[PDB]
Design a protein around this ligand. Structure first.
Ligand SMILES: NC(=O)c1ccc[n+]([C@@H]2O[C@H](COP(=O)([O-])OP(=O)(O)OC[C@H]3O[C@@H](n4cnc5c(N)ncnc54)[C@H](OP(=O)(O)O)[C@@H]3O)[C@@H](O)[C@H]2O)c1
Ligand SMILES: NC(=O)c1ccc[n+]([C@@H]2O[C@H](COP(=O)([O-])OP(=O)(O)OC[C@H]3O[C@@H](n4cnc5c(N)ncnc54)[C@H](OP(=O)(O)O)[C@@H]3O)[C@@H](O)[C@H]2O)c1
Ligand SMILES: C[C@]12CC[C@H]3[C@@H](CCC4=CC(=O)CC[C@@]43C)[C@@H]1CC[C@H]2O
Ligand SMILES: C[C@]12CC[C@H]3[C@@H](CCC4=CC(=O)CC[C@@]43C)[C@@H]1CC[C@H]2O
Lengths: 318, 318
């Protein structure tokens, strides 16, 4: 179950996310990755900032060793963090991730946010007032660095995450562009269906990869704990009954039928296995319209600590 | 590589057609079906009027018997001809086909044309002037018989072929309707892209299955021999070069990227194998637009001998 990226590479349409809530020990990522592989997942999403890469890598290499899967069958994504967006620091970060993973290459590498922060070991550098220290970096220069990573063979494909319409256009119209971003990984679910951004990406052969498909893991420090819980939406409960599935399966299927590559995370083995059942049924055209009606501009992860940054992506309509 | 029908069943998106030109011995169907199976084809399209069902059935059963494939992995389609549309004759025709195939069930059964003809052994009954003898049979009455065939387990799914927008509506609005048609098999290629009918079918959860994807086999007595040869289209040649593929592969991929289930036939082993490579590449969004521009209302199989029939489907815009 894959789709073809604009650079010719194949990406599985359903991927398991390896970000873990703060309350979880990082080693948890290793057990979950194993469980996911056994359940049939071949696409895994990670990032330098998650700090789960080494554990995810051990799980994968472990499943490759015992002959469960081959590296070529696994699609692994990483992301360069805000502190290494400087053109001279991008490749170093990728090489560091590859060292942690003990991998020869990653299948996809993305710019995590179009917002650079002060370079340094600390992922969240703050001043004496506790405010993040922003940095100015030419995003087009950063993209050129990403392209060089692809030409180095360190990553098979390159893309971006949390970019808005104008920022994507900035890259697409860049003089001397060599490789278009293969995707734009953003938050997307019934409460924030991204209709406009999705149509734009499609028109440019850019795949929209969605996180927050099930309402996000509601991370402390990022998601308002008082925001509504997506899966508690009555409409999803009613539709789950109609199709004799679950609210989660309904939300997952909704995105797949819109041409979106879906990410998902669960700390529970039973749910990891359940989510694979999304390929078992079809939502009717009319029910897809019903789900479209839930749109209410509810953004669970507005990256509020970045407010004020010149490149904060969520101010524009899309 | 399947899509989900509105009755829950799965259908492979690429199917091998078993209709043969008059110039071919019917037995040719047996060897071609075996070759298609070896190449990876699981979806086979046939019809009682083709007179190749017993040969196709023999090929499939031979491959099932030697362990190459399982019946459950094969998706076989048959169609009831105009002379058996009467409610009292539909089932007998399907049972007759099952007898020829030595199958217990077919996966899909279609009304071949929305035009009933005088009942009898002859598939093309004509009067003393050589004109087809039409018959009056309510399309909804015929559909009820199709539903009964599905309930009897003789066919897993039911659909139609060569129906226009209004005829589909007739079935969809039928009082007491039990099962919607899962598909509408019609001619479709860059010269007749069926944009409007396709959108209508999608809005009703009806899959559009296309034949004539490569310009049809240009059957004598049905297709104008001087009509342009689809694959000789310069645009397809240019695109084939750009993608390092072939005109045929470009035409096949075009339909797949539009959510269409594609049928294809070649009397040559090398081409049957080649067509399976359609899953290897992606046509850009921009090139898809260029192909949409080739539309010129060129209908290779207008069923001209049927002109005059009250239900001739090709007069309406769509
Ligand atoms: N690029 C970015 O900026 C960014 C940001 C955030 C996340 N991500 C990526 O997206 C991945 C997904 O994380 P997410 O935060 O967006 O969460 P999510 O996939 O939206 O999942 C949210 C919640 O769904 C629940 N869930 C999962 N399967 C379920 C089922 N079958 N039934 C009921 N509940 C179910 C989980 O709870 P339980 O664990 O209790 O089952 C989880 O807390 C991450 O791991 C990461 O790879 C990327
Ligand atoms: N329901 C209906 O009314 C209806 C009507 C007509 C057909 N059909 C179905 O559709 C199926 C397909 O038949 P069709 O008439 O529509 O033909 P088609 O699939 O459009 O193929 C047309 C021609 O393409 C050529 N071709 C195939 N692969 C090729 C390649 N890789 N390179 C170059 N040329 C290639 C073939 O020639 P060669 O053999 O010389 O390679 C063939 O004559 C039938 O067998 C039948 O199952 C249904
Ligand atoms: C919210 C997001 C995923 C969760 C992480 C966060 C950075 C800080 C964090 C540190 C942790 O030890 C657990 C996860 C998380 C809370 C990430 C910023 C971008 C996005 O991927
Ligand atoms: C053109 C079409 C497929 C080809 C056949 C035709 C009926 C007469 C025929 C008789 C034959 O022995 C060979 C095929 C064919 C020429 C069919 C009518 C509807 C369509 O499926």
């Amino acid at each position: 179950h894959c789709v073809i990226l604009n650079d010719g590479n194949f990406i599985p349409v359903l991927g398991f996310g390896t970000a873990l809530p703060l309350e979880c020990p990082k080693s948890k990522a290793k057990e979950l990755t194993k469980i996911a592989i056994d359940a049939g997942f071949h696409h895994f999403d990670s990032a330098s900032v998650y700090n789960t890469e080494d554990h995810v890598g051990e799980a994968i290499r472990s499943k490759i060793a015992d002959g469960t899967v081959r590296r070529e069958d696994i699609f692994y994504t990483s992301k360069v963090w805000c502190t290494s967006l400087h053109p001279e620091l991008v490749r170093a970060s990728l090489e560091r991730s590859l060292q942690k993973l003990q991998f020869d290459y990653v299948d996809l590498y993305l710019i995590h946010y179009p917002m650079a922060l002060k370079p340094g070991e600390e992922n969240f550098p703050v001043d004496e007032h506790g405010k993040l220290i922003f940095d100015r970096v030419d995003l087009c220069a950063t993209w050129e660095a990403m392209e060089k990573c692809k030409d180095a063979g360190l990553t098979k494909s390159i893309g971006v995450s949390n970019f808005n319409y104008r920022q994507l256009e900035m890259i697409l119209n860049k003089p001397g562009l060599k490789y278009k971003p293969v995707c734009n990984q953003v938050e997307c679910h019934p409460y924030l269906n991204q209709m406009k951004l999705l149509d734009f990406c499609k028109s440019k052969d850019i795949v929209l990869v969605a996180y927050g498909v099930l309402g996000t893991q509601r991370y402390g420090g990022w998601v308002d704990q008082n925001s509504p819980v997506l899966l508690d939406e009555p409409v999803l409960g009613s539709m789950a009954k109609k199709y004799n599935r679950t609210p989660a399966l309904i939300a997952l299927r909704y995105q797949l039928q819109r041409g979106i590559v879906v990410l998902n995370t669960s700390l529970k083995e039973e749910r990891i296995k359940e989510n694979m059942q999304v390929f078992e049924f079809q939502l009717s055209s009319e029910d897809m319209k019903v789900l479209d009606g839930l749109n209410r501009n509810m953004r669970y992860i507005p990256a509020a600590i970045f407010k004020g940054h010149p490149n904060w992506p969520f101010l524009d309509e899309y």
